Amino acid sequence: SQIRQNYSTEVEAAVNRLVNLYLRASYTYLSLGFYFDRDDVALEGVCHFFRHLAHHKHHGAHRLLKMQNQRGGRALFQDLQKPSQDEWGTTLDAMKAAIVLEKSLNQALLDLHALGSAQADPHLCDFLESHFLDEEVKLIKKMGDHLTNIQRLVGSQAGLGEYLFERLTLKH
Amino acid sequence: SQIRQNYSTEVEAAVNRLVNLYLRASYTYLSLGFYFDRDDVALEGVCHFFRHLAHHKHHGAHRLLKMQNQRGGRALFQDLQKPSQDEWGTTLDAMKAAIVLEKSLNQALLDLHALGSAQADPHLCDFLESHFLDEEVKLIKKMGDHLTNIQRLVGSQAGLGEYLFERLTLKH
Amino acid sequence: SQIRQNYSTEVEAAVNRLVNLYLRASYTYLSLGFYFDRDDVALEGVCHFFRHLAHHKHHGAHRLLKMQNQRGGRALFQDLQKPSQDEWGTTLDAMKAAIVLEKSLNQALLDLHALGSAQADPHLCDFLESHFLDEEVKLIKKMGDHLTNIQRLVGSQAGLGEYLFERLTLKH
Amino acid sequence: SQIRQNYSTEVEAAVNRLVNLYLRASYTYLSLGFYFDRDDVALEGVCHFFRHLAHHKHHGAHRLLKMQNQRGGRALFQDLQKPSQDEWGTTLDAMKAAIVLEKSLNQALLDLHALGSAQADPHLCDFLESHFLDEEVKLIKKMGDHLTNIQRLVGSQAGLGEYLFERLTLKH
Ligand SMILES: [Cl-]
Ligand SMILES: [Cl-]
Ligand SMILES: [Cl-]
Ligand SMILES: [Cl-]
Helix, strand or coil: CCCCCCCCHHHHHHHHHHHHHHHHHHHHHHHHHHHHCCCCCCCHHHHHHHHHHHHHHHHHHHHHHHHHHHHCCCCCCCCECCCCCCCCCCHHHHHHHHHHHHHHHHHHHHHHHHHHHHCCCHHHHHHHHHHHHHHHHHHHHHHHHHHHHHHHHHCCCHHHHHHHHHHHCCCC | CCCCCCCCHHHHHHHHHHHHHHHHHHHHHHHHHHHHCCCCCCCHHHHHHHHHHHHHHHHHHHHHHHHHHHHCCCCCCCCCCCCCCCCCCCHHHHHHHHHHHHHHHHHHHHHHHHHHHHCCCHHHHHHHHHHHHHHHHHHHHHHHHHHHHHHHHHCCCHHHHHHHHHHHCCCC | CCCCCCCCHHHHHHHHHHHHHHHHHHHHHHHHHHHHCCCCCCCHHHHHHHHHHHHHHHHHHHHHHHHHHHHCCCCCCCCECCCCCCCCCCHHHHHHHHHHHHHHHHHHHHHHHHHHHHCCCHHHHHHHHHHHHHHHHHHHHHHHHHHHHHHHHHCCCHHHHHHHHHHHCCCC | CCCCCCCCHHHHHHHHHHHHHHHHHHHHHHHHHHHHCCCCCCCHHHHHHHHHHHHHHHHHHHHHHHHHHHHCCCCCCCCCCCCCCCCCCCHHHHHHHHHHHHHHHHHHHHHHHHHHHHCCCHHHHHHHHHHHHHHHHHHHHHHHHHHHHHHHHHCCCHHHHHHHHHHHCCCC
């Protein structure tokens, strides 16, 4: 490559794996969104919450791929595994599965940041700091806030609480 | 007729029967709307939901009648039977009765579409496709969404759930 | 299902397979776009042409999934195979591969339309007619137009022709 | 100094050397720009490309000098060597010489970042991350893109390709 400078093969490969993780996460959120659009589930605010996360994860993949090209690495795409479930249970089940997913993405970001630090790749480290690490902290805090509110609403009237959360917390 | 072309007597008669079904449906929704306006029922959002459907069904009759004349058929009106009930129970009862009604209208549309196909009447088939079939699919999906939300809200506090649904889902 | 009416299991399954085809096509176009963004390829108009098609194919998947739910079918997601190539050759190679891809999607649309016709499912048939069949004819005609212009430009100065096509036909 | 804190003599000296490198780079780009303004070269877009880089490199020197004072170091200026050539050949020769120059500046930035890291100087490290490292990656990617387009245009009509690149890629 005519432009590549200070860009390790280890980082290049890890960036391609992270793209696969982000596209997998977008696919998971596409499935979560359409589950909540089912006539027998019918929680529009939950559907919109996940549809917006699907778009954000797709765009994170796009940012990584643009950066891969800016550094002179080579995008390599692998098969995308389907999401882990076909039906996602309650809003509480879904929000728990989303937090597990985001913590897995955050660990992948932190691992890549540590590789970049070890490789003395400050552009890579800055890039994750500027566009990914704080977005992930903010999203996980918001999901944690939502989990607490959902859990407070279960009581012994689970249906009522799930309706009220979707109506009064989620955007619709 | 000076304009009639490719318009079977079978379709003409079926269009007149469908007009009767739509006007019957408008009458049913007029009754449902005024029931929810009773001082002893008093669910304004439910009243407005049905009043708007009464208007839409009246206008579907109008579209069919305009088309009958555009094709050179003859509008023929029959007696309009009263609605099936004088009192409509809970919002849940009413929304169940509305879904039954819409599925009966949708089957009548599909039956007429199949007659038009058998008669090689593509204008009739297009006309139903363009102004009726998707509107019915969309309305039935919305009613199904509403049924699921109403059912989630019953729990063991039926009054509270019926108030909250009317206040937080239906327009008022 | 409380809403499903006139919606065959055969159509439901074929719609889920078509969603997989559209998401595969979006993935193919994501790969084509990032290939043309490589510093050693560097054809911005070609990159933008494919990036826009990736978005359109993603949105076709979304329309199909929304319709699946409107009809009371169940979205089921499968693994997404990676694109057929890692490197896409010349603009001419890429545009040939895109036409092959679009004709495969168009055949899948026509096959699903024929199943819907056989199943007397006019809503499905209308849905494909209204949102997919003409978009595919228009796109294939545009790709054919582009292929002819690219082929005229090869001559014995292939580099010059590929630059001029990207500069004077494609949006940048 | 009344303000200096955590600012090593090693960093102070390296910042003064980097200022000299940036001012040398500005001077190189001033020479490249005026070469392309010669009546016997006459490539206005190439002239404007280099004139804009001369201004950007001057301003990078300014940012470094402002930072040196903000940290309580002392600006020290050395002689500025003339550019490496008096005549710069073809646009291709010039763009190759520019990429070599930018990679030399990028290595100097990465070296200074590594010194700051070793000295536990996070303000210096942040400063380079925020104002220099990504600008250099973006510029090198753009130059690489331009090199590829220039190389595609040489064919066996070098004059025609150099005209077309200047007319259709570079701003004028
Ligand atoms: Cl899997
Ligand atoms: Cl009666
Ligand atoms: Cl494969
Ligand atoms: Cl010298």
